[PDB]
Ligand binder design. Sequence first.
Ligand code: HEM
Length: 403
Amino acid sequence: TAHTEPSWADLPFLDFTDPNFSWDSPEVAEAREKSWIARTPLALLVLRYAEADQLARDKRLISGFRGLVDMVGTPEGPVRDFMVDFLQSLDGADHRRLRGLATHPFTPRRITAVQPFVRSTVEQLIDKLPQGDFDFVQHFAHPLPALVMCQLLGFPLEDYDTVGRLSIETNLGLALSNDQDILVKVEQGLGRMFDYLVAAIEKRKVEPGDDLTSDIVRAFHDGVLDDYELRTLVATVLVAGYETTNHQLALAMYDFAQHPDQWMKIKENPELAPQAVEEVLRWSPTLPVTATRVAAEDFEVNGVRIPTGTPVFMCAHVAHRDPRVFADADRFDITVKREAPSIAFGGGPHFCLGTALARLELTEAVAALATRLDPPQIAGEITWRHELGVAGPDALPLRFGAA
Ligand code: HEM
């Protein structure tokens, strides 16, 4: 009988954990043309838009995070605890219960309500921008999502830098490991983050506000979740809301620095902003791989059998360059009215909780920056994030206008 899965015989191979690998290489394009799904050593990789969108919702595929933790063999400890218990690792009743307590402030209706704050914050950040060369992350891409999360979670607004610094230094992008050197840094960062969070939580336990930390504390007083679930959930929302938005904002500037004519088009027509943001999400999603799933049962799709326990990764970046769906897919173009959205936010039960908030922050940022400033220009060497997950500039030296 068969030595390998018969339906896997023709699947193109890709190794995204290879120093020379690029999502935009011709070999990746060839793979997507040959097959809707590629084989990697440890996981199947979905490359075409239709299947990536559909399978992220497929109930036969649950969260693969716990599978990955066992795959990398993280030892028993605080880092493993967080990685196996946090929202993205859960499914069924536990997931819907915990996600449910964090949903309210992120619903489209409630995002409308925070819009005035976002616009005012963007305006203020632009008012005090430096006038020569400067780090865009330091002066805009970091402050904006840090302040927004502080506002939503009930943290003092002057704590925005500390909160941002705390999120970065958890090094959660490096947590999928069994190396002790890395795991020391991750644990130390998580501990310091929990120090701030527990202090905020204990304060809301006695004097609650209308913020999300206060909301979750009330659920804790109603016995819906325990103390550990409480702090883990707050930590989850904070980290997931900060780094992604930060890097995506920095990628937006990078995209327009490479294509400044399109910046002038938004200045000419501010109405282009939402479409422009969606193009940034299509062209350069901060999470090239969005949904990390695992087969919960044996099933078949397009004649390819996916047995129980198969890790399945949704490759948003490659799916965004699918010419079956997007016209002139490998060209950055904000002017094209597109039928299909980006799938930068994944899908299914785990679909990004702050999707509407993310689009708001990006749209408000882009619209105001383009209306008030000249096109961005790269002003020095960029420091890129070299990790699995969040991608984009950690530091972006630039100037708005040649003079
Ligand atoms: C401040 C705004 C944001 C907030 C509050 C937020 C929050 C969250 C949370 C709590 C989760 C876990 C959901 C779950 O497991 O049930 C999540 C997942 C996710 N987020 Fe975000 N996020 C934000 C911005 C972004 C941005 C800018 C991107 C990239 C474009 C992004 C991409 C994703 C993806 C791809 C997932 C996984 C979805 C899946 O597995 O199907 N998020 N987010």
